[PDB]
Amino acid sequence: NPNYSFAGKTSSISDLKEVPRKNITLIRGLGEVYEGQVSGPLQVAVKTLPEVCSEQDELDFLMEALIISKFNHQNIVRCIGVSLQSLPRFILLELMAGGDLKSFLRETRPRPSSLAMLDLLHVARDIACGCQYLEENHFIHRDIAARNCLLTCPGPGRVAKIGDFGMACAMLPVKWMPPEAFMEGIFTSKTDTWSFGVLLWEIFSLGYMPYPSKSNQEVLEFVTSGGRMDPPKNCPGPVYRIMTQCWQHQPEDRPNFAIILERIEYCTQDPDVINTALPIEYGPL
Ligand SMILES: Cc1cc(-c2cc(NC(=O)c3ccc(CN4CCN(C)CC4)cc3)[nH]n2)ccc1NC(=O)Nc1cc(C(C)C)on1
Numbered sequence: 001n002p003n004y005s006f007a008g009k010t011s012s013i014s015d016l017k018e019v020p021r022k023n024i025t026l027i028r029g030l031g032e033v034y035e036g037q038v039s040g041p042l043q044v045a046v047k048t049l050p051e052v053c054s055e056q057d058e059l060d061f062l063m064e065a066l067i068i069s070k071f072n073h074q075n076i077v078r079c080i081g082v083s084l085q086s087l088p089r090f091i092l093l094e095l096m097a098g099g100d101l102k103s104f105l106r107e108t109r110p111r112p113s114s115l116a117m118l119d120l121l122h123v124a125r126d127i128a129c130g131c132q133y134l135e136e137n138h139f140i141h142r143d144i145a146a147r148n149c150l151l152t153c154p155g156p157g158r159v160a161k162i163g164d165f166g167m168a169c170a171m172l173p174v175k176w177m178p179p180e181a182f183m184e185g186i187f188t189s190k191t192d193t194w195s196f197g198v199l200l201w202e203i204f205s206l207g208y209m210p211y212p213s214k215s216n217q218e219v220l221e222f223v224t225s226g227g228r229m230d231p232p233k234n235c236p237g238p239v240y241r242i243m244t245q246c247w248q249h250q251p252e253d254r255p256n257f258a259i260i261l262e263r264i265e266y267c268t269q270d271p272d273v274i275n276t277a278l279p280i281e282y283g284p285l
Helices: 004-010 055-069 101-107 117-136 179-184 189-204 216-224 237-246 257-268
Strands: 024-029 033-038 042-049 079-083 089-094 149-151 160-162
Touching: 004 055, 033 089, 042 055, 055 079, 055 089, 101 149, 101 189, 117 149, 117 160, 117 189, 117 257, 179 189, 179 216, 189 237, 189 257, 237 257
Parallel strands: none
Antiparallel strands: 024 033, 033 042, 042 089, 079 089, 149 160
8 A cells, every 4th residue: 555654654553542442332333334432422433343354454454543643634534543452443533423425415405505505615625625734744545536525514514524435447436537547557646636626526516426427438438538527517617617627637737735725715705606506406307
């Protein structure tokens, strides 16, 4: 893994707060990830390591906790502690009651105001802010997507944060990847930029699958030939232009996350943008 060597040399297991297993109670499944409680109270999410695992999974498990623990930013999910001295091993994580962003967008689509344009911009700003922090600390996420963004709560005042559920040829998330990534296996900060562009499309489409009527191979050929997605329905021009900038063919021509963040912020300052109405579905279609 491209992150393990640096994290291992610059972060210690002693930095991880071991919580006695007796003080951890699992409450309910969430998706393995459980809602748990630490007392004897703190509300947490709990990732488990299956007892039947390799010594590589043992490493992967430890490294997840070490890598998360190296970060300190409001738009990046926290590692609360661990319980590695008991089986099955636990990682204690910031509980995000809002759930994943993709599910949130789909379930909160305006149906005959659940969401407004400014709400989408704030989510995009939140994630862009976290990505800038990651970039500034030379961390390449490699799987920026709505499925890996979490929300603190559903109502107003919600905060979006970057995480990684770790789900990542047939397995490559091609629809979120720039050409140099799915052709050459090159990953940089500018490949995260491309992915963020796709995430923006997910947000303002209100949770649609990217390249809606296309398979992965069709997207592969589409993108390599210069093809790009159309704007989501009712998407403001200034927002779409951020997307198309993120999708410049050469990484040198893509903006960094400082610039992306500035441009998102400019959009929130534009009444014509934030007063734009999101589309409404109508059941019978
Ligand atoms: C693995 C995992 C899960 C959570 C989590 C899930 C929930 N919550 C849920 O999963 C959930 C919550 C509520 C609901 C219910 N819904 C919400 C309310 N609705 C009304 C109904 C649906 C469903 C699922 N909280 N915390 C947090 C962190 C991690 N691990 C990582 O992020 N690892 C990283 C990170 C990085 C970065 C690159 C540094 O690198 N590796």
